[PDB]
Amino acid sequence: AQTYEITYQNSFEGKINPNQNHIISITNSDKTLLFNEKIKNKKADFPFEVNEINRKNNEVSQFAFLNNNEIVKTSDNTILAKQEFKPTSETGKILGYNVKKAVTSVNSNTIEVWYTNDLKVKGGPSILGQDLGLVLKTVRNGSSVVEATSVKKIKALDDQSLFNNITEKDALTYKDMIWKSRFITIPVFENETINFSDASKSDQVIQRFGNGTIILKKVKIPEIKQGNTIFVELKQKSNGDAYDRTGDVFIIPQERAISYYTGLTQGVKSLPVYQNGNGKSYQGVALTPDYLPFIELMRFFTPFGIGHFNEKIQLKGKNWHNNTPYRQDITELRPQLSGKEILIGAFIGNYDKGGHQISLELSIHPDQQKIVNNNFVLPVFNTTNVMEMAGQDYPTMFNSDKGVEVEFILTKDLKNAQLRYITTGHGGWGAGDEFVPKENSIYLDGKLAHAFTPWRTDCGSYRLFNPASGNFEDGLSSSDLSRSNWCPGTITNPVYINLGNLNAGKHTIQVKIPQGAPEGSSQSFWNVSGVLLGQEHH
C-alpha cells in the first residue's frame, strides 16, 4: 500500500487566497486521512475537525478536537453510498493524472468532481466524491474551486502523533459539542420554577423572594473585551398558571451605597422614596446620589399557560407550541457585565402555586463588531415593580405631569449618549392603558428629546403560543389584541433614544405619559426603564 499526499488550493472566481490553510489528503488503499497544514504542524486553533475513511468498509470517522485534552468522534458507514453522482463524458489531465468529471447536487448546489483512478487509491479535499476515486478538483456553483497542487509519495500514513482522550459520540451530539466550544456559555437557571407560594424558600445556591415570584443568583462573568457580542436566552413554560404575566430578567448594580438587593433583603422601606406631588409615593424607582435602580436585561411576557394547558384546551386546527423562547442582544450592556460578579435574577408577576418554569443562559461570542461602541452604562430609572409581591407599588406616577424626573450627575464628558428605553402600558380593560395608545415623552435638561406612541399591532401572530387565551364573542382571542408595546409570548425591544453629546455635570431627564384614569379598583400603570449609554472621555 503506497501512501500518497495530496495538497490542495482554494480559488474563488480566479482569486487565489493569499494566506490560506491548504487542505491536505494523505491516502492509501487501506485508510485515508483528511486535514490541513495547521493541523499537521500543530498550529491549529480549537476547535478543529479531522476525517478518516476506512476503505475496508467505507466507515467515515470524523474526529473533533475540542481542547488540549478531549477529542470526540462519530462514525458512519452509510455516507458514501448515499452520495448520488451523475456521470459525464468530460475528461482531461490534472498534474499528469487522467481524470473524469462527475456531477451532483447538494441542497440546490451544483458540485463538479474531477477524479482519477490511475493510482488505485481514493481521496479528495472533502467528503464529496471519495468513493469515485482520487478527487483532484472540485467546483462548487462554478465559482468556488479546490484544485490539487501536488501529489507526493510518502513513507506511511501515521496519525498516532496527531492523537496521543477520544470519546465516541452520536452525530447530533458531535455537531452540538463543536458548536458549544466556539463560544462561552454561562448557565444561570435550569428548570427552576417561579411561583406564588408560602412554601417557596431560598436555598444555598438560589435565593427566592416575593413568595417565589423572584429568583436570584450570584454568578461570575469573565472579562469580556470590546468587540464581543452578548445575548440572554430564556426558555419559559407554564406549570399551572394560565395567565398573561409580565416577566423580566434583571441585574442588580451594587456600584453605590444602596442597591435593589437592599430592597429584596431588608424590605422596600430601605429603598429611596420617589414622590411626584400626585399624592402617592413609589420605591426604588429613580437614581439618587447613592442608589441605583436595577437594570432590565430583557423584559418579556408569558403567553396564556403554554405547555400546561395544551392537552386541556383543544381547538380545531391549532397545535400549540410546548414552550416559549426569548433572546435579546445585550452587547450594549458590556461595561456593567464584563469581569464582574453580578447578581442576576428572574421575575414573573404571578399568583399561582404551580406557576411557571424557567431556563436562563447568557452567551458571549468572539466577535469584533464596531457598531455598538458604548463605553459607559448608568441606570437612571426603573418604574417596573419586580417587588410586586414584596411591597413595591405599581407605577401609577404618570398620573401627574411631572412623571418620572431624575437628576443625575456625570463626572466625565459623554459622547454619542443615548437612552435605552423600555416601555409597556398596562390596565387590563378596554379603556385601560394596556389597550389604549399613549404618547411617551422623554425630556432632557428640560427640552423635549423624543416623543413616540408605543404600540404593537402584531400580537395575533403568536396565537399558537397561547392555548389558554380567552376567546371573545367578536371572534378575537385575548392574545390577538393590539397592545401598548407588548404581546403575550414575546420580548419588548428597547428603544435607543439619541441624546447627542453630554457635558460633565448636572443633567436632568424626565418622562411624561398621559396616564388613563382608574375605572374600579383597576388602575392603569406604566412599567418603564431607562439606562444611560455613551462613550466617556478624558
Q: Rounded distance, CA 408 to CA 430, Å?
A: 37
**Do 162 and 292 fall into the same domain?**
no
Last residue of a domain, one of 182, 199, 220: 182
**Do 421 and 340 fall into the same domain?**
no
**Do 361 and 255 fall into the same domain?**
yes
**Do 431 and 342 fall into the same domain?**
no
Strand partners, 296: 250
Cβ-based neighbours of 474, under 8 Å, separated by 6 or more: none
**Do 359 and 415 fall into the same domain?**
no
Here the CATH number for the domain that contains residue 342 is 2.60.120.1570
**Do 212 and 192 fall into the same domain?**
yes
Last residue of a domain, one of 182, 203, 238: 182
Domains: count for the chain:
3
Q: Rounded distance, CA 228 to CA 231, Å?
A: 10
- What does the DSSP 8-state code read for residue 389? G
3-state helix, strand, coil in the chain (%, to 5): 10, 45, 45
Last residue of a domain, one of 350, 371, 392: 371
**Do 168 and 205 fall into the same domain?**
no
Q: Rounded distance, CA 330 to CA 364, Å?
A: 10
Strand partners, 477: 471
Is residue 72 a contact partner of residue 163, using CB atoms and an 8 Å limit?
A: no
Give CA angle at 101 (26, 147), nearest 5°.
45
The DSSP line for 276-304 is: -SSS-EEES-B-BTTB-PPEEEEEEE--S
Q: How was this structure determined?
A: X-ray
Resolution of the experimental structure, in angstroms: 2.8
**Do 367 and 244 fall into the same domain?**
yes
- What does the DSSP 8-state code read for residue 266? H
Q: Rounded distance, CA 142 to CA 419, Å?
A: 49
Look-up of cell digits 435579546: 328
Give the domain extent around 15: 1-182
Q: Rounded distance, CA 27 to CA 31, Å?
A: 6
> β-pairing, 15-16 with 3-12?
antiparallel
Cβ-based neighbours of 305, under 8 Å, separated by 6 or more: 238, 240, 241, 242, 243, 466, 467, 468
